[PDB]
RNA sequence: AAGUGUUUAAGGGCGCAUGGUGGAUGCCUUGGCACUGGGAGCCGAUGAAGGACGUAGGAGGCUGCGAUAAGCCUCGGGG
């Protein structure tokens, strides 16, 4: 739901805030699926990829590639 | 009266006609084998070769991947 272009616009601290937010959303989704009340299975994959994106961007800024 | 003489198949054999079992034969192939012309001839403490355990919305194997886990970013191809 968020693209690498938009992520590169946020400050370092805003990215870390978004990473916590996504981890909380993933946690809620896992519980909803264990309870069997989650209709859209695909939200798990998308949230997980969103976490991976934020990590990638953060690492690029440390390595000086951005 | 004396004499002649067919007439059983419990089961078996042989032939033929129809089947079963079995997977030979013919015709094949996603696999092999032997080589030819090139490439590259090393990988590893910046943790290798090879593995364990994990990883997808649903059990397991093979494949891919590593808690960013059948994937993340960028540059090109493609349609
Ligand atoms: Mg050498
Ligand atoms: Mg492209």
Swiss-Prot record:
One of its GO terms (molecular function) is structural constituent of ribosome. It comes from Mycolicibacterium smegmatis (strain ATCC 700084 / mc(2)155). PANTHER family: 60S RIBOSOMAL PROTEIN L35/50S RIBOSOMAL PROTEIN L29, LARGE RIBOSOMAL SUBUNIT PROTEIN UL29C. Keywords: Ribonucleoprotein, Ribosomal protein. SUPFAM superfamilies: Ribosomal protein L29 (L29p). It comes from the Bacteria. This is Large ribosomal subunit protein uL29. InterPro entries: Ribosomal_protein_uL29 (IPR050063), Ribosomal_uL29 (IPR001854), Ribosomal_uL29_CS (IPR018254), Ribosomal_uL29_sf (IPR036049). Belongs to the universal ribosomal protein uL29 family. Pfam families: Ribosomal_L29. One of its GO terms (cellular component) is cytosolic large ribosomal subunit. Gene3D superfamilies: 1.10.287.310. One of its GO terms (biological process) is translation. NCBIfam families: L29.
């Amino acid at each position: 739901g968020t693209t690498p272009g938009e992520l590169r616009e946020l400050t370092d601290d805003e990215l870390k805030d978004k990473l916590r937010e996504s981890k909380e959303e993933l946690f809620n989704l896992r519980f909803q699926m264990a309870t069997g009340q989650l209709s859209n299975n695909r939200r798990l994959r998308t949230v997980r990829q969103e976490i991976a994106r934020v990590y990638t961007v953060l690492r690029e800024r440390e390595l000086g590639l951005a």
